[PDB]
């Protein structure tokens, strides 16, 4: 993190302080696919047969 600060500042001297060096994000690892009841019969069930 000190090197992160030196590279955000483009300085080899860092004064006491708070520096913004990056950005942290939580990334998705999985997915949820949710759809309505497939019990509501589709007319293809009437066209065929």
């Amino acid at each position: 993190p000190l090197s992160e600060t030196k590279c955000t500042l483009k300085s080899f001297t860092v004064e006491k302080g708070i520096y913004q060096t990056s950005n942290f994000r939580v990334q998705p690892t999985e997915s949820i696919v949710r759809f309505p009841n497939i019990t509501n019969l589709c007319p293809f069930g009437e066209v065929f047969n």
């Binding site: 993190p1 001297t13 999985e30 949710r34 009841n37």
Partner: protein, 167 residues
């Protein structure tokens, strides 16, 4: 990643903290943003918490003092972000840091009353903001302080007057 009956976005599901009227599957926050979704198969509702995010900043002493620093990860768990000195607060996760329940004047903010500084080994320590020494001056309705010994102090201020005549 989510896809609820064609509605997409990202987040973390938790059991809902609000009821929905029978009219709706999708509940929303200010500026029409999805807050929660009734599950398409199960008659239960879950809230969608955005996947946490924020900036990353380094709390550091000067390099003319030491190379010991801590990193603040805003609005996230330390379990999502890691050395032995790991401290979790409400504002974010500090790695290379500890915490003390006392308040001090401070140079570096974390936010919401939470401070940081480089202190004794000399890890970054999260602190409460003190607002200075508490001057619990005594008062009375039968006593007046009358100045006898005065000094002349000189202070400074530099004011902007003009900018570069850019062409």
């Amino acid at each position: 990643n989510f896809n609820f009956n064609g509605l997409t976005g990202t987040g973390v599901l938790t059991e809902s903290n609000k009821k929905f009227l029978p009219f709706q599957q999708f509940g929303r926050d200010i500026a029409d943003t999805t807050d929660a979704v009734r599950d398409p198969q199960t008659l239960e509702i879950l809230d969608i918490t955005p996947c946490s995010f924020g900036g990353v900043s380094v709390i550091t002493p000067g390099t003319n003092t030491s190379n010991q620093v801590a990193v603040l990860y805003q609005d996230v768990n330390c379990t999502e972000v890691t050395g032995s000195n790991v401290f979790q607060t409400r504002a974010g996760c500090l790695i290379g840091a500890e915490h003390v329940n006392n308040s001090y004047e401070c140079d570096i903010p974390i936010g919401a009353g939470i401070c940081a500084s480089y202190q004794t080994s000399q890890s970054i320590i999260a602190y409460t903001m003190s607002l200075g020494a508490e001057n619990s001056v005594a008062y009375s309705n039968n006593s007046i302080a009358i100045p006898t010994n005065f000094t002349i102090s000189v202070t400074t201020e530099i004011l902007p007057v003009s900018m570069t005549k850019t062409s």
